[PDB]
Design an enzyme around this catalytic site. Structure first.
Site, mmCIF file in Angstrom:
data_model
loop_
_atom_site.group_PDB
_atom_site.id
_atom_site.type_symbol
_atom_site.label_atom_id
_atom_site.label_comp_id
_atom_site.label_asym_id
_atom_site.label_seq_id
_atom_site.Cartn_x
_atom_site.Cartn_y
_atom_site.Cartn_z
ATOM 1 N N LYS A 144 40.310 35.909 54.640
ATOM 2 C CA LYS A 144 39.015 35.349 54.939
ATOM 3 C C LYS A 144 39.075 34.518 56.205
ATOM 4 O O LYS A 144 39.979 33.693 56.385
ATOM 5 C CB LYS A 144 38.438 34.501 53.774
ATOM 6 C CG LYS A 144 36.936 34.358 54.122
ATOM 7 C CD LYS A 144 35.906 33.810 53.154
ATOM 8 C CE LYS A 144 34.698 33.339 54.045
ATOM 9 N NZ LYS A 144 34.693 31.832 54.216
ATOM 10 N N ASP B 113 31.184 22.355 45.001
ATOM 11 C CA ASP B 113 30.496 23.569 45.414
ATOM 12 C C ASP B 113 31.332 24.834 45.244
ATOM 13 O O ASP B 113 31.026 25.852 45.871
ATOM 14 C CB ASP B 113 30.021 23.466 46.860
ATOM 15 C CG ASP B 113 28.687 22.879 46.944
ATOM 16 O OD1 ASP B 113 27.746 23.700 46.963
ATOM 17 O OD2 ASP B 113 28.579 21.621 46.930
HETATM 18 C C1 LIG Z 1 35.831 52.963 42.266
HETATM 19 N N1 LIG Z 1 35.775 53.422 43.665
HETATM 20 C C2 LIG Z 1 35.072 52.416 44.483
HETATM 21 C C3 LIG Z 1 37.129 53.659 44.219
HETATM 22 C C4 LIG Z 1 37.835 52.343 44.491
HETATM 23 C C5 LIG Z 1 38.132 51.936 45.730
HETATM 24 C C6 LIG Z 1 38.812 50.631 45.922
HETATM 25 O O1 LIG Z 1 39.819 50.416 45.240
HETATM 26 N N2 LIG Z 1 38.291 49.755 46.826
HETATM 27 C C7 LIG Z 1 38.079 48.425 46.594
HETATM 28 C C8 LIG Z 1 38.407 47.892 45.347
HETATM 29 C C9 LIG Z 1 38.200 46.548 45.106
HETATM 30 C C10 LIG Z 1 37.649 45.704 46.082
HETATM 31 C C11 LIG Z 1 37.459 44.230 45.654
HETATM 32 O O2 LIG Z 1 38.362 43.889 44.914
HETATM 33 N N3 LIG Z 1 36.338 43.474 45.979
HETATM 34 C C12 LIG Z 1 35.999 42.140 45.786
HETATM 35 C C13 LIG Z 1 34.661 41.724 45.855
HETATM 36 C C14 LIG Z 1 34.295 40.371 45.690
HETATM 37 C C15 LIG Z 1 35.263 39.374 45.459
HETATM 38 C C16 LIG Z 1 36.611 39.767 45.424
HETATM 39 N N4 LIG Z 1 37.643 38.913 45.153
HETATM 40 C C17 LIG Z 1 37.946 37.712 45.670
HETATM 41 C C18 LIG Z 1 37.131 36.953 46.551
HETATM 42 C C19 LIG Z 1 37.640 35.712 46.958
HETATM 43 C C20 LIG Z 1 36.957 34.717 47.819
HETATM 44 C C21 LIG Z 1 35.601 34.431 47.810
HETATM 45 N N5 LIG Z 1 35.305 33.400 48.662
HETATM 46 C C22 LIG Z 1 36.391 32.897 49.243
HETATM 47 C C23 LIG Z 1 36.610 31.872 50.172
HETATM 48 C C24 LIG Z 1 37.933 31.665 50.614
HETATM 49 C C25 LIG Z 1 39.017 32.433 50.149
HETATM 50 C C26 LIG Z 1 38.845 33.462 49.206
HETATM 51 C C27 LIG Z 1 37.544 33.696 48.726
HETATM 52 N N6 LIG Z 1 38.840 35.286 46.494
HETATM 53 C C28 LIG Z 1 39.593 36.029 45.669
HETATM 54 N N7 LIG Z 1 39.126 37.236 45.250
HETATM 55 C C29 LIG Z 1 36.946 41.128 45.573
HETATM 56 C C30 LIG Z 1 37.333 46.250 47.338
HETATM 57 C C31 LIG Z 1 37.541 47.607 47.594
#
Ligand SMILES: CN(C)C/C=C/C(=O)Nc1ccc(C(=O)Nc2cccc(Nc3cc(-c4c[nH]c5ccccc45)ncn3)c2)cc1
Length: 320
Positions: free
Chosen positions: A111, A237
């Site tokens: 990020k 927040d």
């Molecule tokens: C089935 N078909 C599609 C085939 C599959 C394809 C495939 O495998 N693609 C795929 C799979 C999974 C994804 C995925 O996992 N997407 C996702 C979406 C929203 C949130 C998060 N997690 C988070 C966010 C933050 C976070 C927020 N705000 C922050 C501010 C500072 C620092 C960190 C943060 N932190 C930790 N985890 C993950 C993306 C692509």
């Protein structure tokens, strides 16, 4: 045979920089314990290539790693091998979400943050590290795995790497950002394929979370400790991120078995209980704990952290 190619030069500099940092650290002894100086340290590298590797890499760039001893110790306490970390971030380019990326294997989140975010990371870092030590890495807080500054082509960004809350393998068909403040997803936002619902959508759509009494008691006690730590640091927040994997929908929509996950990799997963009306796996942890003081003060153009933590805990307590 990695070349760190990408259409985005910042991603190439990021891949080259993570490669460089981890290899550098392999030439640095693992200390018995971190010392105060390790929490104000950095390494800076400036690279100027002339007529060399001119197709894979920008010719002029800078890469800075903050507190590299500390983030190495953190990775270790979070169960992450440095070589694996290195592979996840360099074997193929991180993927945009379409301002956040995931590693190509979906293990880590990358990020872009602001420089005040970097300053606040440094202010909480000793306290954060001590907390991770004392809870043996078992926490719902974000796991901060490395922090960097990149410069290429006259553009400078700060980035931070954290563990993905969601599974690297099990797909997520429904996510929420929960605060206890209320908070409704836009009509634009619900037009996406993978919308981020919020407090009022959780209630209005009747969302249930079917986990058994024991897992729920363990989660709420962890949550209460983590949020009390956040309140003492005067942070607020933050959200609980909630991802739901629907087993039956994952099957109809396309060597571990149906609905199963490795709790050593997908550390936030919780199975539903044996009498849930639908076979589901939940992924839940806390995200976005930094203040963003000036970003939010120019955004405008009250609740204190004590109060925030208590609204938060009461709301989550009520919906599990
Ligand atoms: C089935 N078909 C599609 C085939 C599959 C394809 C495939 O495998 N693609 C795929 C799979 C999974 C994804 C995925 O996992 N997407 C996702 C979406 C929203 C949130 C998060 N997690 C988070 C966010 C933050 C976070 C927020 N705000 C922050 C501010 C500072 C620092 C960190 C943060 N932190 C930790 N985890 C993950 C993306 C692509």
């Amino acid at each position: 045979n990695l070349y760190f190619q990408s259409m985005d030069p910042l991603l190439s500099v990021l891949m080259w920089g993570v490669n460089h940092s981890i290899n550098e650290l392999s030439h640095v002894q693992i200390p018995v314990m971190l010392m105060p100086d390790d929490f104000k340290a950095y390494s800076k590298i400036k690279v100027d290539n002339h007529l060399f590797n001119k197709e894979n890499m920008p010719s002029h760039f800078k890469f800075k790693e903050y507190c590299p001893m500390v983030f190495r110790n953190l990775r270790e306490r979070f169960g992450i091998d440095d070589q694996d970390f290195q592979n996840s971030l360099t074997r193929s380019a991180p993927l945009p979400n379409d301002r956040f990326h995931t590693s190509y294997d979906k293990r880590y989140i990358i990020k872009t943050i602001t420089s005040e975010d970097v300053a606040e990371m440094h202010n909480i870092l000793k306290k954060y590290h001590q907390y991770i030590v004392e809870c043996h890495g078992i926490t719902l807080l974000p796991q901060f795995l490395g922090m960097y500054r990149l410069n290429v082509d006259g553009v400078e960004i700060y980035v931070i790497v954290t563990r993905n809350v969601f599974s690297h393998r099990l797909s997520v068909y429904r996510k929420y950002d929960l605060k206890g403040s209320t908070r409704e997803a836009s009509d634009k936002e619900k037009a996406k394929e993978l919308p981020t619902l919020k407090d009022n959508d959780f209630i209005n759509e009747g969302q249930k979370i079917y986990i058994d009494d024991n897992n729920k008691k363990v989660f709420l006690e962890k949550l209460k400790k983590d949020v009390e730590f956040l309140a003492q640091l005067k942070l607020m927040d933050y959200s609980l991120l909630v991802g739901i994997h629907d087993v039956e929908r994952a099957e109809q929509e396309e060597p571990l078995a149906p609905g199963e996950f490795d709790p050593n990799i997908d550390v936030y997963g919780i199975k539903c209980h044996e009498n849930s009306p639908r076979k589901e796996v939940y992924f839940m942890a806390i995200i976005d704990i930094l203040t963003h003081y000036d970003a939010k003060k120019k955004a405008a153009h009250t609740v204190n952290p004590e109060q925030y933590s208590k609204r938060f805990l009461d709301f989550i307590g009520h919906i599990l």
